[PDB]
Write a protein that binds this ligand. Structure first.
Ligand SMILES: CCc1cccc(CC)c1NC(=O)N[C@H](CC(C)C)C(=O)NO
Ligand SMILES: [Mg+2]
Ligand SMILES: [Mg+2]
Ligand SMILES: [Zn+2]
Length: 890
């Protein structure tokens, strides 16, 4: 396998200044003519001119209008076009190619492809080379003049980046449109779209310069009624970047386009953002609640890339976190501001501490700036994105809002119109830091270890209180486990946002303060502390770490009740659950291993249950927050604390704990389920796709969480509630009805009822598939076969394949069936999918990431399947690299 190393970056010996494309779409072929206005750079040493170009059929190649011939002036091996150095000019030259590509057969959804009746591109990271020849790396920045031609009836809307400067008719029922994008860009930001698209539009006026910007959102005709919320979210995004960052949009027009077939969420192509339809389109009668926050976040993210990625781009792909971590942090500030609910930040944290922490203790562990790769596409990871966002967020915590905004403006301005590296960002932040500290010798050199050091730090605490002196100390230690990337791990710069709670009255005892831990250990002392406090640690989840609070459960319950910080209250609850889960898991495991005839289980703490009841009964407490407290920690979080995990024992553990709590609280749960109905299900705004009440949504979330707990419990006559719930106008509720009906004989009636409600909207049907896939059914494998035969069939749509299989892989009892049948099922899907879409096939490998955390029989079963997949003939490079790394061969 072919390996790139971060330290080996060098600038090209060539420059591409202008790109002039003609993309002529026909039924059975697309012809791409391209003129590159090129030159030799100051780094040239008379090397061969080598272009990336994958799967292209050459019609012609020339330099300065001299035809070049294969075997004489060039070679082409279907990956690289090499122009021998003797035929490479020494000054400004025109390189011309014409190639034929086939979007109609491109099922990998990279390069130029067909999605239903739309032709669309996806170029990040390495797709532009599947369109035409290029030096396809992000430091090759150029300006683009793009003409698209097509059949007018089929493809009446033609789009590429930038200003539309002409439109023209062509004989034989064709037409064309020409675009000029004035902004220098890397080729990964190139896009083109051709389709029978409908739109909604609005005009936005920029806050400071009063520039009129035309905003267009596009879909296929069937779904144009589903565009409004995205348009609204775009306006919101624009205003947020103006308001917080002082950043205005920089073209006369911005287009967003939904396509049905897309490998990931969306893409920030300049002036022409392209979305998975599932991340752009919604309506309140045909989408679940969660669609709304997803569209807000994805529109926002792609918008924020207009500065953090587009106006300031990447020197090389090792810098990916500089655009993705920073953009996710911007996205997260935006969504926290727009929703005004504490659950938004909690959701981010839950994502990190489950999936990213698992990744960071897996064989795939990498620093947010990797040192090497084979397919760049495998490093679009939750590490680079979500840990990167937390590292980008820590600057804000450290500097505070005012000095953070100063540093960010230093960065964005210095590096405008150019490439940048992670070091450029740290330098900007370090200038702000100097200013904030009033000290020109202060530096953030140690901060750079957040970019280079893999693994999750562990931060642990000890406390002491001197009652005579009224003086409190917090002794803090950090540790990172050695790994394949570093045999010796250095201490990080860890900001610890802290409060102190008086346990006798529940009140705050200090101004919140942010402790800067920079050594392996340190002791922070507080004076004028009138009584022994309970510390409120890592408020807001102030660094991406494992926290060992060394608190008793009684102290944790007091924080849950009385602290101000949602994260700390939620984490204190999480920690109580984790202590219980590990204890009960150990008890079940020992009983199983020793084949005991009888044994004991530690009961759930009764004062903790009382605290849950108190918070649920408090009408002034937050519904979203309540839904987090009645749910156990996710399985992927739990697994970070158990080695050789027996998944059946864990399933039994979780069931015990849920039943202990329900035995005490189910009447409370039922009473709340009923009492929340009127406000949860009020139809205010049901016809308004410009406004979402996120509090009301959290009330539905809470009802639906309670209904699941009551259903699993077989609470008396709950089936009557499930049936009434199925009649609700909200899809979040009627699809819940299907899920929770799993525990009753009514499931197949609700399966059919909901299928009929879902089948005529593509995205609703995919939400129905997810609902079925995740259902807690003993007969889930027969259900999956039913979905394969009746609904999924031969679909190559990644949303369909993901909907049918991923939820099922999170079924702890059934996916991990000790036969290995679950592993075998998903591995066959992965291998099948890899033959046409390697990126999606790698996505589908997610369940295997934890393989070396399982009990030794399940490890062996997973490993067996992974090595079977590795033996498949013509396995993609994407999948092969992934699986070699995951199985500790690479
Ligand atoms: C933010 C969601 C996300 C997290 C981690 C990794 C991925 C890519 C597998 C994603 N989803 C995206 O939609 N990411 C795209 C990647 C583009 C190259 C297609 C992106 O960041 N859009 O801006
Ligand atoms: Mg081809
Ligand atoms: Mg379809
Ligand atoms: Zn992004």
């Amino acid at each position: 396998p072919k390996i790139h190393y971060r330290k080996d970056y060098k600038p090209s010996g060539f420059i591409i200044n202008n790109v002039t494309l003609n993309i002529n779409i026909h039924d059975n072929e697309t012809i791409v003519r391209s003129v590159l206005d090129m030159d030799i750079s100051k780094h040239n040493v008379g090397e061969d001119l080598v272009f990336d170009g994958v799967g292209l059929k050459i019609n012609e190649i020339s330099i300065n209008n001299k035809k070049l011939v294969e075997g004489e002036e060039y070679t082409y091996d279907n990956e690289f076009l090499t122009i021998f150095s003797k035929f490479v000019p020494k000054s400004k030259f025109a390189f011309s190619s014409e190639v034929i590509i086939h979007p109609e057969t491109n099922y990998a959804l990279t390069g130029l492809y067909k999605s239903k009746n739309i032709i669309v591109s996806q170029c990040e990271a390495t797709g532009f080379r599947r369109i035409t020849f290029f030096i396809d790396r992000p430091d090759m920045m150029a300006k683009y003049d793009v003409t698209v031609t097509a059949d007018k009836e089929k493809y009446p809307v033609l789009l590429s980046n930038g200003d539309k400067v002409n439109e023209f008719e062509i004989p034989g029922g064709r037409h064309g449109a020409r675009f000029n994008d004035p902004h220098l860009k890397p080729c990964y930001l190139f896009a083109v779209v051709a389709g029978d698209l409908k739109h909604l539009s609005a005009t936005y006026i920029t806050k400071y310069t009063k520039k009129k910007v035309e905003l267009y959102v596009f879909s296929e005709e069937k779904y144009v009624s589903k565009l409004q919320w995205a348009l609204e979210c775009l306006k919101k995004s624009m205003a947020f970047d103006e308001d917080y960052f002082g950043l205005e949009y920089d073209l006369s027009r911005l287009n967003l386009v939904a396509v049905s077939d897309f490998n990931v969420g969306a893409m920030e192509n300049k002036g022409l953002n392209i979305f998975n339809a599932n991340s752009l389109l919604a309506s309140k009668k045909n989408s679940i609640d969660f669609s709304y926050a997803r569209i807000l976040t994805v529109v926002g993210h792609e918008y924020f890339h207009n500065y953090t990625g587009n106006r300031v781009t990447l020197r090389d792909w090792f810098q990916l976190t500089l655009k993705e971590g920073l953009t996710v942090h911007r996205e997260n500030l935006f969504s926290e501001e727009m929703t005004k609910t504490v659950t938004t930040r909690l959701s981010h944290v839950d994502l990190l501490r489950s999936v990213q922490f698992l990744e960071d203790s897996s064989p795939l562990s990498h620093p947010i700036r990797p040192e090497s790769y084979v397919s760049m596409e495998n490093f679009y990871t939750t590490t680079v994105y979500d840990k990167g966002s937390e590292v980008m967020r820590m600057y804000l915590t450290i500097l505070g809002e005012e000095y953070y905004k100063k540093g960010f403006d230093i960065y964005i301005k210095k590096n405008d119109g150019n490439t940048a590296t992670c070091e450029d960002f740290n330098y900007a932040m370090e200038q702000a830091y100097k200013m904030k500290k009033a000290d020109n010798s202060a530096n953030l050199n140690q901060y750079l270890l957040w970019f280079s050091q893999s693994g999750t730090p562990h931060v642990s605490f000890k406390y002491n209180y001197d009652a005579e002196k009224k003086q409190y100390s917090i002794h803090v230690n950090q540790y990172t486990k050695p790994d394949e990337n570093q045999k010796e791990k250095k201490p990080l710069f860890i900001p610890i946002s802290v409060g102190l709670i008086n346990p006798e009255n529940g009140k705050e005892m200090i101004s919140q303060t942010t402790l800067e831990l920079t050594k392996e250990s340190d002791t922070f002392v507080f004076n004028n502390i009138a009584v022994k406090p309970i510390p409120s640690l890592f408020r807001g989840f102030s660094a991406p770490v494992y926290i060992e609070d060394n608190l008793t459960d009684e102290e944790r319950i007091l924080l849950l009740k009385y602290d101000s910080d949602a994260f700390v209250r939620y984490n204190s609850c999480t920690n109580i659950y984790m202590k219980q889960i590990l204890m009960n898991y150990n008890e079940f495991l020992k009983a199983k291993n020793e084949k005991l005839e009888s044994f004991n289980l530690t009961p759930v703490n009764a004062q903790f249950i009382d605290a849950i009841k108190y918070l649920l009964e408090d009408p002034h407490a937050d519904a979203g927050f309540k839904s987090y407290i009645v749910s156990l920690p996710q399985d992927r979080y739990i697994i970070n604390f158990v080695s050789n995990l027996d998944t059946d024992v864990l399933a039994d553990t979780k069931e015990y704990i849920y039943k202990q709590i329900g035995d005490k609280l189910n009447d409370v749960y039922y009473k709340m389920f009923k009492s929340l109905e009127a406000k949860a299900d009020d139809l205010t705004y049901f016809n308004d796709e410009s406004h979402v009440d996120f509090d009301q949504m959290n009330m539905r979330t809470l009802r639906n969480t309670l209904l699941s707990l009551l259903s699993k419990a077989q609470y008396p006559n709950i089936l009557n509630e499930i049936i009434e719930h199925s009649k609700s106008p909200y899809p979040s509720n009627w699809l819940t009805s299907l899920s929770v009906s799993a525990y009753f004989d009514k499931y197949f009636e609700l399966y059919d009822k909901t299928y009929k409600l879902s089948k005529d909207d593509e995205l609703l049907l995919q939400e129905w598939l997810k609902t079925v896939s995740r259902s807690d059914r003993k007969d889930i494998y027969e259900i999956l076969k039913k979905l394969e035969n009746e609904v999924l069939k031969d679909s190559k749509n990644p949303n369909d394949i993901r909907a049918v299989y991923l939820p099922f892989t999170n079924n702890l009892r059934r996916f991990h069936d000790i036969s290995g049948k679950g592993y075998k099922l998903i591995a066959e899907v992965i291998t099948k999918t890899d033959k046409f879409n390697p990126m999606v096939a790698t996505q589908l490998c997610e369940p295997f990431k934890l393989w070396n955390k399982l009990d030794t029989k399940r490890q062996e079963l997973m490993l067996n399947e992974m090595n079977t997949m590795l033996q498949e003939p013509n396995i993609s490079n994407n999948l092969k690299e992934y699986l070699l790394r995951l199985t500790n061969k690479l």
